[PDB]
């Protein structure tokens, strides 16, 4: 530190005294992030393991709100043949929130899954289900021949093929009106140019891949001016104490040391500031306790040395720090036989003004030579 003092004072000769040279700070180790426990899972399990399934003409719509959408539980299974999504990619839908979710579920033919593609116009893509001009979701589909196929077949599933005009978006028209044509209007009967819109599905093991029943669930995310309610899951790491780190508590970002406290916060209170309008204490979102934030240690660096003519022995003073953080606060990385010897050793003394290294504490009292603070003086003479 004699070299640092010479560089700061811009003089190779240093007079007897104390001089401030630089500053030291403590940096966060890696990071800390915390969030409340995830206990508001959306009821996707009921849809995944539904006992009864709805027909196309009665495709079922489900409202999803005020719950966390954890799609990883179904994504890791990878048991769905069709995993197409639009608006947001499946691997990056976690980092954005929506205020509502529509879940439309039905069972169709295996080759008709493409008919559920957004914006398609066709016999099934217009006359059974319609979609708006914007999509922010998925059109997931999977095979359902294991459960929906049984001996003897089923006739409770109907599809619409004939209708007057295209369906209005987000409408489920459950009607049995017979289609009529202007060339020959039956007007009350099912004669020429008049047929039932709905035909029954054919369930049998001999059906091919295209004819095999497939369960299709289309999910549509949506956000409006109203506050968002369906947010993706946020991972919270382990909580560390008595260590300087950059912490993120419920979106509040700070840097410092989190230490256990005895403050009794109100049940509705999350954090607590001080008179100076700075964050002081934080409640752990997962488990209930209060942690105070110490704004690191930092401080000033002062060099204690006599005149260069007298000798070259030097001492190091750190301001407002305990004698435990000195080897970590930007240290032990400089040149070894010069700086590393002035960070640790048996000459470390703790004073009210901070930590002093390079001087020996003696019970005797003499006239002050180099003042430090709080009635502390360093002298080169023994």
């Amino acid at each position, epitope marked *: 530190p004699l070299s640092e003092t010479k560089c700061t004072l811009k003089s190779f000769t240093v007079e007897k005294g104390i001089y401030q040279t630089s500053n030291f700070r403590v940096q966060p180790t890696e990071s800390i992030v915390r969030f409340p426990n995830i206990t508001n899972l959306c009821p996707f399990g009921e849809v995944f393991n539904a006992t009864r399934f709805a027909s196309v003409y009665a495709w079922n719509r489900k409202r999803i709100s005020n719950c966390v959408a954890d799609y990883s539980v179904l994504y890791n299974s990878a048991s769905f043949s069709t995993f*197409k*999504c*639009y608006g947001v990619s499946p691997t990056k839908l976690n980092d954005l929130c929506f205020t509502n979710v529509y879940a439309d579920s039905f069972v169709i033919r295996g080759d008709e899954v*493409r008919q559920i*593609a*957004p*914006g*398609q*116009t066709g016999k099934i893509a217009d006359y059974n289900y319609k979609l708006p001009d914007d*999509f922010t979701g998925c059109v997931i589909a999977w095979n359902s021949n294991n459960l929906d196929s049984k001996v003897g077949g089923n006739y409770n599933y109907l599809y619409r093929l004939f209708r007057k005009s295209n369906l209005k978006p987000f409408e489920r028209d459950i009607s049995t009106e017979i289609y009529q044509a202007g060339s020959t209007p039956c007007n009350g009967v099912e004669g020429f140019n008049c047929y039932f819109p709905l035909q029954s599905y054919g369930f049998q093991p001999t059906n091919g891949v295209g004819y095999q029943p497939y369960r299709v669930v289309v999910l549509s995310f949506e956000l409006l001016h109203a506050p968002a309610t369906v947010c993706g899951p946020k991972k919270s790491t382990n909580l560390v104490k008595n260590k300087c780190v950059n912490f993120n508590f419920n979106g509040l970002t700070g840097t410092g040391v989190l230490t256990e406290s005895n403050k009794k916060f109100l049940p509705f209170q999350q954090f607590g500031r001080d008179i100076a309008d700075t964050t002081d204490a934080v409640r752990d979102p997962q488990t209930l306790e209060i942690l105070d934030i110490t704004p690191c240690s930092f401080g000033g660096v002062s060099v204690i040395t006599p005149g260069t003519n007298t000798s070259n022995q030097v001492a190091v003073l750190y301001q407002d720090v305990n004698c435990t953080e000195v080897p970590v606060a930007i240290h032990a990385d400089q040149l070894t036989p010069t700086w590393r010897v002035y960070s640790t050793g048996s000459n470390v003394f703790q004073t009210r003004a901070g930590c002093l290294i390079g001087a020996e504490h003696v019970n005797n009292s003499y006239e002050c030579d180099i003042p430090i603070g709080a009635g502390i003086c360093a002298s080169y003479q023994t």
Partner: nanobody
Amino acid sequence: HVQLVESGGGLVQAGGSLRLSCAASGRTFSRYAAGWFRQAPGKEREFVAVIEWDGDSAYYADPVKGRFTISRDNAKNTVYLQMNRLKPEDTAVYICAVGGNHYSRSKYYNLDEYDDWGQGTQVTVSS
């Protein structure tokens, strides 16, 4: 009724550049992911390129990797395929399809995963 029209094709000299424009007329063009495929006599049908709604991420086949560019324009409801450093082996009929966004690599070889099918345009190289 999203009508698809193809233009910009024809016969071009070797070593030049080409631009094939596929225009889709409809109210759901933005919801469609644009796929481009090629077909040549004596060769099996192979997937060429696919681009999403925003166009930031696009997927191209290995034989045509790093050789052609794809772009979109929602305001004009058009998609453009730029061929650079053209070769005589690229003389073929190109087809543009709109509808559905796919993420499976093995599912890009099927033309049944798109809503509407167009007519395509012929690209020929003169030596």
